[PDB]
A and B are shown apart, each in its own frame.
Chain A
Amino acid sequence: VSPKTRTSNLKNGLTIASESNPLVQTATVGVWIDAGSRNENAYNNGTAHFFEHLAFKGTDKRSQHQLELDIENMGGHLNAYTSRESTVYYAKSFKDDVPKSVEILADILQHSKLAESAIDREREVITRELEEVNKQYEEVVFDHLHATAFMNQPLGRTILGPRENIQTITNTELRKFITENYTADRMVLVGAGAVDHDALVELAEKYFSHLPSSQSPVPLGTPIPNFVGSEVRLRDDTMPVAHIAIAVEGVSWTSEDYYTALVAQAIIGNYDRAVGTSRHQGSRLSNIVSENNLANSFQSFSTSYSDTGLWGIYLTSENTTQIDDLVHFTLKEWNRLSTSVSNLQVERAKSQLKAGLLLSLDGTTYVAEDIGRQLTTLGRRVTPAEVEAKLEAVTEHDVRAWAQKTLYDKDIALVGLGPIEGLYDYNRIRNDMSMMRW
């Protein structure tokens, strides 16, 4: 039984949340913000990601070089990432270097220069990033997947933004973005590892007390997405591996079906020919795929947002003449979540998940990421006892009912990249979303 997550607020409405571990000697402190690319419009799309670059380009006190030196002298590192709904800025350090790291984070968030010279310099760096994501096939597939599933909607936009915006982003719009979005009621200061909660609250009172509050404070993790059944094909005969994602509209963080969708996802599970144990997994799809050499890997996913989600599978295969079989067998395993699953699969998946949700948190950065994610999506850290109860409440009837309303005979978003000549047209893929025998 893990130590209790302590939570305090400041007057502005900044949440401080901590989980101490007296067995480690490092600490991860950082700021989780309930804001990301989705908060941009079409004209300033790319701003949030642009700011992330400039946050490390110098503040009103420390220059770019001084910033570098200060962190080098601390001994640990700083890291940041911007997603569609969430931005994170954290610092991993030694136990007693925590006050330094909180001070640096407070500086780069509140007091960043955003100097025209630096805007202009990064504008090329970010332009080069547009032509090099092209290599990260999983990311290419998932970005096209969001773009098509949420066609012409904010969740459909990329994080980098269009080339056009990169050339026209000004310090004015950068400043406007972080003034509107980086408000105290949207921010959580998180500490995990060798942190004292009371010490962290004091550091918050010292550095984050002059943060603006938003005019209308909504609760943390407050949001209408209209999913489009659709396909993007990026055929490239020169690539040896096909990458395919298939998804349906999934569940939000606060859906009542959140755990049901996780259990369903665990019934299909993951597979990777490179891992020794994968040929012995219990999942039916795993057995079909491994026996017939249909794929190098597959990974089931259930991505959530504040008001929607995507539930589906990502496949990679070199078997270019049997892509049809791979997709066919995958979707017939999904059909069985509607028609055939019983207590046998459901209780097996529950067993696997009860551990999986706890195992994931195996270092201070993972713990901080868990506290930060849960605080910015649900408004609270959910105790493992509550999570164990919600998983236990999932029955086979719940899984069947969920799959019959979410998967069965529903539109999919489909992205294929690589040698995908063998991937059939939309109708034949979508026809596998039901079974004529049932």
Chain B
Amino acid sequence: AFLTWAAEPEHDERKKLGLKAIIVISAMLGLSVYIKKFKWSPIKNRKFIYNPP
């Protein structure tokens, strides 16, 4: 365990910062899905009537 710490002394801090990043990035991902769907809905919902000239 001591040698593992010697190889990677940032280990404890790194994993805590990772937890914060995971949470924020996940939330941002979820919101970005809502926002994309919101903005795209006029294109997805578009309907056509064709009367051949």
Chain A contacts to B: CB under 8 angstroms: 231, 425-427
Which 6 pairs, one residue from A and one from B, show the smallest C-beta to C-beta distance? A426-B42, A427-B39, A427-B42, A425-B42, A425-B43, A231-B42
The 6 sampled A-B contact pairs (Cβ below 8 Å) are: A231-B42, A425-B42, A425-B43, A426-B42, A427-B39, A427-B42
**Which A residues lie within 8 Å of B39 (CB)?**
427
**Which A residues lie within 8 Å of B42 (CB)?**
231, 425-427
The prevalent SS among residues of B at the interface is helix
Nearest A-chain residue to B38, judged by Cβ: A427
CA distance A410 to B50 in the complex (A): 30
CA distance A427 to B42 in the complex (A): 8
Interface of chain B residues 1 through 53 with chain A (CB within 8 A): 39, 42-43
CA distance A51 to B40 in the complex (A): 45
CA distance A367 to B2 in the complex (A): 100
Closest chain-B Cβ to A230's Cβ sits at a distance in Å of 9
**Which B residues lie within 8 Å of A426 (CB)?**
42
CA distance A107 to B29 in the complex (A): 72
CA distance A425 to B40 in the complex (A): 11
CA distance A231 to B45 in the complex (A): 12
CA distance A231 to B42 in the complex (A): 9
CA distance A231 to B43 in the complex (A): 11
**Which B residues lie within 8 Å of A425 (CB)?**
42-43
Closest chain-B Cβ to A236's Cβ sits at a distance in Å of 9
Closest chain-A Cβ to B21's Cβ sits at a distance in Å of 29
CA distance A425 to B43 in the complex (A): 8
Closest chain-B Cβ to A207's Cβ sits at a distance in Å of 47
CA distance A225 to B42 in the complex (A): 22
CA distance A323 to B39 in the complex (A): 22
**Which B residues lie within 8 Å of A231 (CB)?**
42
CA distance A357 to B53 in the complex (A): 44
Closest chain-A Cβ to B41's Cβ sits at a distance in Å of 10
